[PDB]
Structures are given as C-alpha cells and as structure tokens.
Structure 1
C-alpha cells in the first residue's frame, strides 16, 4: 500500500510542481529546493543536536546541505519495512514546510549520507525513487545528515543556475530567526563563502 502511495505522491508533485515548490521558470522554485532542505537541518538544530549547517554550491550546479545533528534514524520501520530515512525522504508531509520528498521528487538525482551509531549510511534517488535500500558504506565517530540534490531540468527551465546572493539573503535571514544556529555557505565555482550567526 505504501510503495503505491509513495509513487502516487511523487507523480502528483511531478505533474503539478507549482502547488509544492512554486514557479519553475523564474528561479523562485529552484532556490526554494535549497531552503526546504536547509529548513530540515534547522529543525534538528532547534531540537538542540546540530550546531553547524554547511550549504555548498557545487560546480555541477547541485547543492548539498550538511548538518552535525544525530543523523536520520536508519532502523527499518517494522510498519512499512524500509529505513526510517527512506520514509522521511519519500513520503509527502501551503507552499512553505512542504517536506523534503518534494525536493526529492523534483531532483534528477539526490544523495543521502547519514553518520549515526558508529556507521556511515548512503542511498541514491532518481526523481524521488531509491536506487537501493539505505546501506552501510563504512564506519565513523561523527554524526549528522548530508543531502546533495541535482535539480531536474525536466522540471526547472530559464533560471537553472543557483545564485549565491539569493541563498545568502535567506540563510542570513534563517540565522537571524534561529539564534544559536551557525550557517556556512560556500560556492565551489569561485571559492566565495559566508558565515551567518546571530
């Protein structure tokens, strides 16, 4: 029932993305993809477990968000028989707080790395669909969640390149609204970076 329902959700967002992420031509939906993911990292900081969030603009016009929180739980849900991470990355829930599955749905590719309980876990998605169940790839002393997404050029036209200043404005805004949380923005394309703390 869950697999069928998840795919209905991804299909729903694919066909009517204006209802979930916003305008797909003018760049406002493309940048909102970043802010949805960052918002999830801010929830983990507001729970008191994350101190630093790193937002990177990569050269291939993908964006990663890294937190040093406790990592998305990896335990296979007894209920629907897949990692809790995959439930969070794929299940749907106005045009704010839309859930990370929307970003996943409208991403050509999405990379999940979780560090938790001594192990690194990795998963790949294409258009919201897991390539393989979450899997252990190594060990670590660290904790946190890293999400990197390549926006679908099926979904996004005209403004397809992330603009530093637009991410910079909102991240500085988010650090003002959530005192304590530290945010790094880094552009791999030209080396630019900022640090937002209030």
Structure 2
C-alpha cells in the first residue's frame, strides 16, 4: 500500500523530530550534529564492505551543509511495488547504524543524487519529506550515491557548525577499521583536505 507506507513514514519522521536525541545523540553538545555525517558515511561503509564502494568523499560546504559521495552501485532507483515509490525514497524515509532516514528527518533540506544504469537521478527532501518522486536529470557512465544535507537549526543548538577536526578523527578511525577503503575529507570553507587510507 502506497497509502499505508506514506502514513507510516510521516509518523516515523514526526517521532524522530519530537525525540531527536533518542535517535541521533545530544542535540546541544555537537555529538548529535557530527553523528549526522557519520550515519551517512556508515551507509557508504556498508557499500564498501559489500565490495562495490572503494572511495568515500566527505565535503564541508561553505553554507555549512555536508555532502557524502561514494563510488558504490548507487542506491536502487526502481519503483518498489509495495510502497509504489523508488527503492531510494524507501531507504531515505523508512525508520530503522540509526538509519539514513534519521539524518533526513533532522535535515532542513537533503539532496540525493544517484548515478546508475547510465542515468543520473535526483530528489530533494525537506524535513525528511520528498518534494517530488526521484527523477532522471541526465545520463552518466559513473555509479554511486551523493547525499548532501543541511542540518535543522531547530533541532540542533549551541554547536551548529561542523568542526573539521571532529570529522577528521572519526573518518581516520573508520579508514583504520575498514582496511582498503579510501576516505577523503574536503573543507570548502578554507581549502583543507585529508586522505585517510589503511
């Protein structure tokens, strides 16, 4: 049921928005804010442990959004018959690693770009709610997934700006734990880059 899926998803988004610390960690001391990045990266790490993702690129944008790009297969784009929406929309919205739906719920905005089967697919979310169905925007010979999110400053207080060093420490750690995955970190605010690989 297209319909029952939509009702269940919106109850899930409401649950996360009302009790955000329960899902992401402390919303004031910066740990929940940085965990937003690490949850997205952990999904790319899963796609590396599956053996398709070899490189993960984490970018801090000058507007204080963060993007995570992988070179994996790309989140599946076909209509999942039960929910009647793209398998990507299901992954991005269904509550379950805390699940990328938690990051989506707690993002003012989220941009999804999927490259696979020779096409580029894009979708925009606001507070976990898709603006429109996943749509093809052009062709590509590449594969992978890009998630860019703008954290809600309704949810997150006090520590609101991403700290390069906090991201660098956990990404260095994840590269140590995941031998042969390359994890790049880029700060568009000041030109800092790192390249973690073990």
Q: Distance in 2 between matches of 1:149 and 1:80?
A: 24
**Equivalent residue number for residue 39 of structure 2:** 36
SS of the aligned residue for 2:80 comes to coil
- How far the C-alpha of 1:39 sits from its partner, in A, is 0.1
**Structure 1, gaps ≥5 residues long:** none
SS of the aligned residue for 1:73 comes to coil
Q: Distance in 2 between matches of 1:151 and 1:174?
A: 22
Deviations, residues 52-98 of structure 1 (Å, cap 9, x unaligned) = 1000000000000000001001000111100000000000xxx9910
Residues 118, 96 of structure 1: CA spacing in aligned structure 2 closer, same or farther, 3 A cutoff?
Answer: closer
TM-score, structure 1 normalization: 0.97
**Equivalent residue number for residue 105 of structure 1:** 105
- How far the C-alpha of 1:146 sits from its partner, in A, is 0.1
- How far the C-alpha of 1:174 sits from its partner, in A, is 0.3
**Structure 2, gaps ≥5 residues long:** none
Alignment of 1:63 with 2:66, yes or no, is yes
TM-score, structure 2 normalization: 0.97
List, as ranges, runs of 4+ consecutive aligned residues in structure 1 with deviation greater than 3 Å.
Answer: none
Aligned Cα RMSD in Å? 1.3
Q: Distance in 2 between matches of 1:12 and 1:115?
A: 31
Residues 96, 120 of structure 1: CA spacing in aligned structure 2 closer, same or farther, 3 A cutoff?
Answer: closer
Deviations, residues 96-155 of structure 1 (Å, cap 9, x unaligned) = 910000000000000000000000000000000000000000000000000000000010
SS of the aligned residue for 1:111 comes to strand
